[PDB]
Amino acid sequence: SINQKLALVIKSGKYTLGYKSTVKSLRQGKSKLIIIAANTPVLRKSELEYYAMLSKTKVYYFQGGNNELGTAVGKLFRVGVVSILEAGDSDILTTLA
Amino acid sequence: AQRVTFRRRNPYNTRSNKIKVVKTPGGILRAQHVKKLATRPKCGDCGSALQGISTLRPRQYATVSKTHKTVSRAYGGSRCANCVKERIIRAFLIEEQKIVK
Amino acid sequence: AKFLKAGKVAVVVRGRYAGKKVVIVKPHDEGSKSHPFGHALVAGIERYPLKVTKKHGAKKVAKRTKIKPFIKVVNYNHLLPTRYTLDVEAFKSVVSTETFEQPSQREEAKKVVKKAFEERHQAGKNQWFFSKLRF
Amino acid sequence: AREITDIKQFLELTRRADVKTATVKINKKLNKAGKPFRQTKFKVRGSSSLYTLVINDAGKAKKLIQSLPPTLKVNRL
Amino acid sequence: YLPSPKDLRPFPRCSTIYAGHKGKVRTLSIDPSGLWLATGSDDGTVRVWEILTGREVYRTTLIDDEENPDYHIECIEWNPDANNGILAVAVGENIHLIVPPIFGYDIENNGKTKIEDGFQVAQWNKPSQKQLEKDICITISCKKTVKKLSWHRKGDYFVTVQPDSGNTSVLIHQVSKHLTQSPFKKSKGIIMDAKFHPFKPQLFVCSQRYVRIYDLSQQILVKKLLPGARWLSKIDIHPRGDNLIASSFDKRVLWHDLDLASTPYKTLRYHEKAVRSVNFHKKLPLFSSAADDGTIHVFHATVYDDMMKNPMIVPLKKLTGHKVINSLGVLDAIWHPREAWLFSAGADNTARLWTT
RNA sequence: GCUUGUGACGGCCCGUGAAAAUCCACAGGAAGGAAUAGUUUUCAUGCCAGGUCGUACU
RNA sequence: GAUGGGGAAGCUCCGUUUCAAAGGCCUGAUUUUAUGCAGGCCACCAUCGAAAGGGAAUCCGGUUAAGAUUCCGGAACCUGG
16 A cells, blocks of 8 residues: 555655655756645646656555544645655565555 | 814814914914825725835825826736736637637 | 756746846855845846837837846845756856946946847747736 | 035036025034034035035035135125 | 147056966955065965066965865955054955965964954854964955945954845954954845945945945934946955945946946946956056956046045056956956056956056 | 824624715726927926805804 | 707707717828829717815914914915926
8 A cells, every 4th residue: 555655765765755855856857756645736846747747757646635644654744745865675666556 | 281272264173174283483382284194005906005006095196296196017007017917928828729629 | 956047938937027037147055144044046037029010111110129238146035946948058157156246347248148139039939928917 | 415525526516507506504502422523514505405515624624615716696694 | 391648747557466376366465565465276275476577476275175166265455554464365264364374473363463462143263273384474254245345544444245144244353352243233235345434434335236334423314325236246455535436247437436426427338248356556646447358547637635626537547468267257356556557357367566 | 191193913703894976096908299309287386366155243 | 957859739858978960180392194182090079067085386483453374574385387
C-alpha cells in the first residue's frame, strides 16, 4: 500500500515538504517523484504539473486531503505536497504509485 | 473650566458635524470642525487595502498627482499585487492547456 | 534535467514587468554578494508590437511594429518558466554581470537588443513571444 | 508659507518679477542654552505664497541685505 | 478645402601608462602629496605607482581567487590628511585600512598608531596573520558589499555605500573610535554615491534618481536635487561648495547650481555611452567626465561666487586612448591635487596619466 | 484620572444594520507627436474670474 | 407627480417607464448623374422630495452703542478658463 511505501522513505531516504521547497527541487532537477494531495487548489496543482512535465518528473495524486497526507508521512502538521529527492531501500518510484 | 460652542448653525452631533477643541494664539479654547476621515482604497477582488495609494476623500483625488494614486506595475492601481500575480499565472496555464485540448 | 538555460523563455510575475515575456541569457545557479539568491539575467520587451494587417502600408506598419526592449536581473521565484525557447547568440556578449550597474552602459545594451528583437520579428519567428500575454 | 534652505534659490525668487515687496525681520534667540545670538529672516512676498530664508550668522546676514536688488522694495522689521 | 579653449589653458595627451594589472582597473586614488597613485583591479591587487615615471613601487594581493565573480576590489581612497600613509580599500563586504611599507617610520607609524588607538551594523577587527602580511592594519566588516568609500576632509570619518542594504545603505565610520553609525532611519532607493561637503557639515547622498543633501549638525534634509535621470552613477562637489556634477548611465552629465534651482542648470551630452565618473579639480577651474566609450571629456568651469551670474562651462578636450573591453571603457578618474593632470582607470587593465 | 476622536480585535441575530450625485483608478489602444525643433498644462511658477437669497436678537 | 395612454356624464381618477416614431454622437471628392443626404453608432426615460443623510474649498489676530469663520490686516486654500 501507499502508506507502507511512504513509511519507509521518511525513516531512511531524502525528502522535502511543502510547496516552496519542492519547486526549488523541481527547478534544480533533484526531485524524482512528487505527491500532490486532493484538496490542494487547482491553480496550485496545475502549476506543479507544468513544472514537472518540463523536468520529466513522475507525478502521483494522493487520494486524500492534506491533513491525512501529513498522517501518511507521519507529521502532526498538515502537508499539501511532498517530494522525493532520493529513493529509500524500498523501491517507490518503479511501482505504479 | 473653559467651554466651547459649535461655530456652525447645526446644533446636533451628526456624522458630518464633529468638533476638536483647540488652543489658539489668543490664549482661549475654540471649536474646529474636523472633516470626515478618508477610508483606504481597496483591491476589487481579494478585498483589502492596497499599498502606495493615498487615503483621501473622493473629490480630493482630483487635486493630487498621478504617482500618489497609481503604482508602476500593470494593474497596479486596482489590484492586490498577489492577485495580479495569480491571474498572470492562471492566464498562462489555461492558455497553454487550450493547445493541449 | 535543470531546465532554466540560455535558450529559455519565461513570464515575469512580479515588479513592473509583470506578465511580460522574457528570455534568460545568464542563469546564476546560487547567489552572489549582491543578489543573495538564485537569480537570472533576462532580456524581455516592455511595450509589445501592435497588430498589423493587409490594410496598413509603409509608414503605418513601421509605427505599429516598433518594440521597446528591457533588460533586468530577476529572482527565480518571480519567473515562471515556459516550454518555448529562443536563440540568444545575438545578445550573449552584450548582456552580462559587468554590463548591469555602471549606467548608461545599460542603454547601449538595449540598442543591440532592440535590433535583435525587431529583426527577429520581421520575417516573424517565435510568434508566441511577440504576442502580448492577456490577463 | 514655505521655508527655503538654499541660498541660490532665494536669489532666483527676487528676480522672478512678480515680487513687488520683500521684508526683513530680526529676532533675539539663545543658542543651545549658552549665549544669545542675533537671528535674521529674509521674507519675500510671492503672488501665491510667502517664501522665507532663516540665516543664523550675523556676518552672512549683512552681506545678504546688500545682495538684494535695489529696484525691489525692502521693509525693515 | 564664451572663451575658446586656447584662452583657458592649462588643461590635459597621455604621457604615461601605468602598466601591470592583469584585469580591469576599477578604482584609483592620488595621495595627499600628489606623488603616488594607487589603483585597484579585478586581478585582485592594489598597486602603488610613481606618477611621473609609471614605475610600480608596491603591490598587495587582497584577493587570492581573483577569478571569483562574486567579489572584487570596489573602491580605494588615500586618507586625505598628510603623512599617515593610510589607504582605504573596499573589497567585497569589507573595508581594509592599509599602510604600505613605502614611506618610512615617521609616516607609517603615524598611520598605524592612529588606526590602533580605537582599541551592530559593522565590526572592526584586528588583522589575521595573513592580513598583516598584506599590510592590512584593521578591517571593518559590513553585512553587504561595499561599493563606494569616501573620506571626510579631516581624515577621521569616512562614509561608505552598500547598495540595497536598506537602512544601512549609508554608513559613517570614525577611525579614532572604531565606531560605525547608520545616520539614516529611512531607506530611499538604491544608493549610488555618498560624499561629504568640502567644508560644510553636510553629506550628499546620490540614489539612482536623486541627490539628497543632509545637514549632519541639524540632522535634517536641507535640499533634494532633481537631475531628471533614471540611472545616476556618481557625483562630485565643486571645491567652493555651491555646485555639483552628476554622471548618468544614460550618457548625460548634469551640472546643478545648488542655490539656483533643484533641476539641472546645464545638461552635457558629450558621450556615446554610459558615463561612469565625474570629477572636479580641487584648485583649477577644470572638471572631467569619463565614459564606457573609452573617452574622457575635459571641461572648464568658472563659478561666480558673489555676483548674479551663473556658471560658465566650456568644453576643452576629448581624451582618447583607453581601449573598450566588453562594452566598458574608463571606469574611474581623479585629478592631481595641484597640476592640470588627470589620472584614469581603464577596463583595458591600464591606468593612464593625461597631461598638458 | 475625566470628556472625546480613532485603531486592531471579540460578542450578538429566523435582525447581518440606505440610495444617488460626484471623484479617481485600472484594462483597452481609435489615433496623435521629433531633429531642426516638437510632445507633455495629472511637476513648478505666473494671469483672470467667482452670481442669487439667509445672516440682528430670544 | 406631469407626459404617452386608459377610465369617468363630469369636478377629475389610474399609472411612472409603463403596449410611445419619447434624441445626439461619428464619418463622408460615399464618385459620379455633375445645383436635391448618403453610410453607420449608441441604448433608459420629466420633475419634486433633507437649513440634522450625501456634499470642493478659510484660519488666526483686531474692531462695533448694537455686526462678523461674511468688515479690517496678514496668512491660506478650491473650482473653471
